[PDB]
Amino acid sequence: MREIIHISTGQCGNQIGAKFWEVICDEHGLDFNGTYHGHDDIQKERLNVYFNEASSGKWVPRSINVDLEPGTIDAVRNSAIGNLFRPDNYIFGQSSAGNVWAKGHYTEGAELVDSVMDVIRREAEGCDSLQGFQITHSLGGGTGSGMGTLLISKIREEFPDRMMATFSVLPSPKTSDTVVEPYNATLSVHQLVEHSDETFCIDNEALYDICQRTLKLNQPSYGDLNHLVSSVMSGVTTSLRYPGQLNSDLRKLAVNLVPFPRLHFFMVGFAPLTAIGSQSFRSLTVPELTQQMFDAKNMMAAADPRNGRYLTVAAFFRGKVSVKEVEDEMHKVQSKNSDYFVEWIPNNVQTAVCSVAPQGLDMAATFIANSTSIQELFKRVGDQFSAMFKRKAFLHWYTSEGMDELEFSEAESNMNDLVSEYQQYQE
Amino acid sequence: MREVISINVGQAGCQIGNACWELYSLEHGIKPDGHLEDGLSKPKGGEEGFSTFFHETGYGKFVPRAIYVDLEPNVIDEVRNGPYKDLFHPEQLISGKEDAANNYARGHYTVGREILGDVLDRIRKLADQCDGLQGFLFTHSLGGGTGSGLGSLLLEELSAEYGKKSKLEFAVYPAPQVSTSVVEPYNTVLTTHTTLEHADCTFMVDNEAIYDMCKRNLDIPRPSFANLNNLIAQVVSSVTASLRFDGSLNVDLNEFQTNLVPYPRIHFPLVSYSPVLSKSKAFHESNSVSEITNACFEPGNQMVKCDPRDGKYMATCLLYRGDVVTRDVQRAVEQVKNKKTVQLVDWCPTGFKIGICYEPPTATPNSQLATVDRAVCMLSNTTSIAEAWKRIDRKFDLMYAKRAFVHWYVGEGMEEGEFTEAREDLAALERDYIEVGADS
Ligand SMILES: CC(=O)O[C@H]1C(=O)[C@@]2(C)[C@H]([C@H](OC(=O)c3ccccc3)[C@]3(O)C[C@H](OC(=O)[C@H](O)[C@@H](NC(=O)c4ccccc4)c4ccccc4)C(C)=C1C3(C)C)[C@]1(OC(C)=O)CO[C@@H]1C[C@@H]2O
Ligand SMILES: Nc1nc2c(ncn2[C@@H]2O[C@H](COP(=O)(O)OP(=O)(O)OP(=O)(O)O)[C@@H](O)[C@H]2O)c(=O)[nH]1
Ligand SMILES: Nc1nc2c(ncn2[C@@H]2O[C@H](COP(=O)(O)OP(=O)(O)O)[C@@H](O)[C@H]2O)c(=O)[nH]1
Ligand SMILES: [Mg+2]
Secondary structure: OOEEEEEEEHHHHHHHHHHHHHHHHHHOOEOOOOOEOOOOOOOHHHOOOOEEEOOOOOEEEOOEEEOOOHHHHHHHHOOOOOOOOOOOOOEOOOOOOOOOOOHHHHHOOOOOOOOHHHHHHHHHHHOOOEEEEEEEOOOOOOHHHHHHHHHHHHHHHHOOOOEEEEEOEEOOOOOOOOOOHHHHHHHHHHOOOOOOOEEEEEEOHHHHHHHOOOOOOOOOOHHHHHHHHHHHHHHHOOOOOOOOOOOOOOOHHHHOOOOEOOEOEEEOEEEOOOOOOOOOOOOOOHHHHHHHHOOOOOEOOOOOOOOOOEOEEEEEEEEOOOHHHHHHHHHHHHHHOOOOEOOOOOOOEEOOEOOOOOOOOOEEEEEEEEOHHHHHHHHHHHHHHHHHHHOOOOOHHHHOOOOOHHHHHHHHHHHHHHHHHHHHHHO | OOEEEEEEEHHHHHHHHHHHHHHHHHHOOOEOOOEOOOOOOOOOOOHHHHOOOEEEOOOOOEEEOEEEEOOOHHHHHHHHOOOOOOOOOHHHOEOOOOOOOOOOOHHHHHHHHHOHHHHHHHHHHHHHOOOOEEEEEEEOOOOOOHHHHHHHHHHHHHHHHOOOOEEEEOOEEOOOOOOOOOOOOHHHHHHHHHHOOOOOEEOOEEHHHHHHHHHHHOOOOOOOHHHHHHHHHHHHHHHOHHHHOOOOOOOOHHHOOOOOOOOOOOOOOOOEEOOOOOOOOOOOOOOOHHHHHHOOOOHHHOOOOOOOOOOOEEEEEEEEEEOOOHHHHHHHHHHHHOOOOOOOOOOOOOOEEOOEOOOOOOOOOOOOOOOOOEEEEEOOEEOOHHHHHHHHHHHHHHHHHOOOOOHHHHOOOOOOOHHHHHHHHHHHHHHHHHHHHHOO
16 A cells, blocks of 8 residues: 555646646656656655656656546646646546536546546556545536546445545635535535545635735735645645654544544644745744644634534644654643543544655644534535525526436435534534 | 564564664674674673574674564665664565554454464574574554554464463553544553463553653653653663673573462563663762662652552562672662552562662663663552553543444454453453452
8 A cells, every 4th residue: 555546537626636746746856857856765765656667767647637628638738747747647528517517427427437447447557556546626516526426436346445535625605606516516425425435625715814814915816725735635645655753544544533434524724824024933833833723714614613523633743843742732732622622532633743844844734633513514505505406496407417306305315414413423 | 591582563663673672782782784893702792692682693693583573664664774774684574565554453354464474484483593492572552553453463373382481572551641543542452352361471661651751850852752762672671681691690581470470360560760860960869779779669760650659569570780789789678668658468578579680781872861880670560550451441431332433343354242352351350450459
């Protein structure tokens, strides 16, 4: 379990997926052309995790970019990063599905399937033993929602003992840009909690709040939003490609964070948040990074963590850190904020100390927890889905392809059963 | 006797195990490259030094008998890139391609049995080269899947093949206060269910207690795992100090299981390292006989998060090293017994096994410990150890009453009723630990 295959689905997944490889190549010192720049003993020995050793000393990633918009792939290969990806994994279509879940699931998304699963079997034979699959999709579109959920059911069918760590994008309940978003988000959870072993809740509303408060960025664009997401995706698989004191595997983050198969929605986070210019005014210490992880203004979710109760928390301290300062500052938060942690599990947060440091920052830390406050985001989507289903609005766009009124009732019923289980363990 | 086989498994086994051989090479003057430079003869690196732990091969080289078996390649591959890469044989390192994480079910039934057929062949070929094998040495880590699952599986297969072998163990019990894992109490009850019915002596150490022995005593501002492994390595070196050298009272490993473990069960001794002094206060200490002896029973110098004053002492074992007087040992222990705090049992009239060692120990350069003239090792068995086992049981009853993490064990190959039998065996051990200790 040392090779990780990353797959990007949809236009939103391609913008975040392609930007994710730019940060990975910078840590290991890989040029955007193919020839490696600087190799060390802690980086060259772990190049097989996200890259493959081809010919003439060329390292190419195993990214699988599948979408239904030709303008998305053509906008990446013509830049200055498409030379690293193999020109054999980009699989697109002619027609676009738009924001319809029924098109990319069995209508327009059913045209590929065999072509997408063909490149997956080729990468499994070239590697020794697979580990996980990082699928980056979104909830609200047509390709990332319709075809993104169908690909998860096909990988688990052929690889039942493989991890399915997906980075889904949850809708924002504060002024959305689409209309048929609850219809594409409700049907996505019905196919996500039945195959994916773990997922992460990320919304776009909490991204603009961070750039306008801590980062102090005047009118952030779509490029700056990918930096906060790629930093969390790269901060999870740190002990797999770098040694450390208390390492952690992808299966370790599932046993210690998923108490019940129906409860696997996590809350991502990162630290610190130093603005441009205030570098000397901020001290990078262990107690400073701890307060930034348990704060409500630094979370990538639209839910309030103070209202709910925490269950399983996972911390990842990187850089020149000491285990003594980690275990001390961790107990002070649990002892002071005892009302936020449930007494049913005395071990709500574990320790994962790393030894390497990112290129630039001296001390980095991320926050991953599975509190009971995640049910608030599921209630806002359920209220908007039930209000539009009563009037039968925007229904002919799905029933004309092959949908039925029985499938929408089963997807809505599963949304109420998930929220009902979070209230039982919360008490 | 002669040779002693050392086995290091798990995450803590591969880290602390490297610090044990680092101290052994400094006391015997063994070059890390695998030579005999700086030593020649003398008991500090001669015929009495090459025997035990290490092994004499050809071309003037000396390789140890350590067998590093870890289910994570991110730890074994790091040791190969370090300076201590020429000591042990390259074939002794057996890595894996599937991380068992911290799950006891995978490292005992699925992943634990994939390498079980290969680890038994290395021990069999190594035991044949030992002209008179004494016992074994294990380094467990209760809190994961490799140091708990593979460790309990290897101990069961090794006890059935041999039997009459001093199978030592230096496990690391979880801290009763700050924990490091979520499914940590699950890997603790399942480990003690098979450790009691196979192992003969399991030295327990607490990671939280070492933090107190370095911040208040050593005054270390930022202690890490590089300093915790040095204190535990000095404890293992103090037990086998009478066998690897000379002294007035030679103590064998078979004597630790007689004067401390009279019953077939109950074999969980504690540890309290006394020579704990920093380099800044090295000129403000007398290091007398009665001063170091009184520091053994102090809770501040104990490597186990427990209060021995609330309980009663059953059987102690002191290991005096360096240059000490035989008459001063019998007088310093008598003063402690007359304090009316030890609370000796009625059957044992003494219970203070002493062990005078003539070879003075040393300290690792990566620590704040100076070269002392004497060292005292405390290996006692108190009745307050059941208090630490009670706190672990309380954390297991809360997670089992509502079925917290259960599907991770049943889906791999473990019956749900196994947790009930393991809890009943742990509860029966704690019940008999207080009933016998109340009138011993
Ligand atoms: C003069 C100087 O030291 O400038 C720093 C800097 O001022 C600060 C504020 C940087 C700066 O980062 C940001 O402002 C930022 C912007 C969007 C999203 C996230 C951060 C920096 O832009 C980011 C840049 O980061 C890197 O160079 C890392 O290698 C980083 N790289 C990227 O994210 C990256 C950006 C563009 C293109 C390619 C890569 C990285 C981190 C983790 C893993 C891989 C790479 C650094 C240290 C700085 C500047 C340049 C000002 C900080 O961020 C990082 C990631 O280091 C923000 O807080 C830290 C602290 C740094 O000191
Ligand atoms: N004091 C100390 N403890 C360690 C060290 N390395 C590992 N540990 C132990 O490892 C535990 C952390 O859990 P894990 O990362 O899963 O390690 P593990 O319990 O040995 O399980 P595996 O990693 O599968 O071997 C801690 O509770 C420690 O007791 C170390 O270097 N020093
Ligand atoms: N955070 C973030 N969200 C994005 C980005 N690009 C698109 N999105 C989200 O994706 C949604 C649109 O999805 P869309 O591209 O139409 O899906 P598709 O038709 O299947 O490709 C919008 O609601 C955005 O919120 C990005 O760069 N960052
Ligand atoms: Mg390990």
